[PDB]
Target: Protein ea22
Amino acid sequence: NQFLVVRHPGKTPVIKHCTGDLEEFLRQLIEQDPLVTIDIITHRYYGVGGQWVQDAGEYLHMMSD
Amino acid sequence: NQFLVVRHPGKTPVIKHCTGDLEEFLRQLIEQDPLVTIDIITHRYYGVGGQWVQDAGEYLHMMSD
Model:
């Protein structure tokens, strides 16, 4: 959940930890950079090679509706 | 190097391991899906929280020129 990578245009991506409310944190990155892509990375028993990743857009909505 | 996440439009991203030549593997993902985004994730002593990620486009060129 705290292992998410945020991709800035014209630059290289960075991996960011939440400093507060998780929903707000993702929103804040999006709001300040609406071109930014966030992938949220976790781990599973099987997943995809023992690891899995979720689109932050699905993630943010998943927690609401 | 083998921890790279490939992002398909309309879907959710997956994390993929190379099955051959690394340069070819990234190219193959791009060629078959030119809309696809790849982030290549590694680890560092400091990096960004002890971890770092590189844009595959920079990565693929980095190894050439």
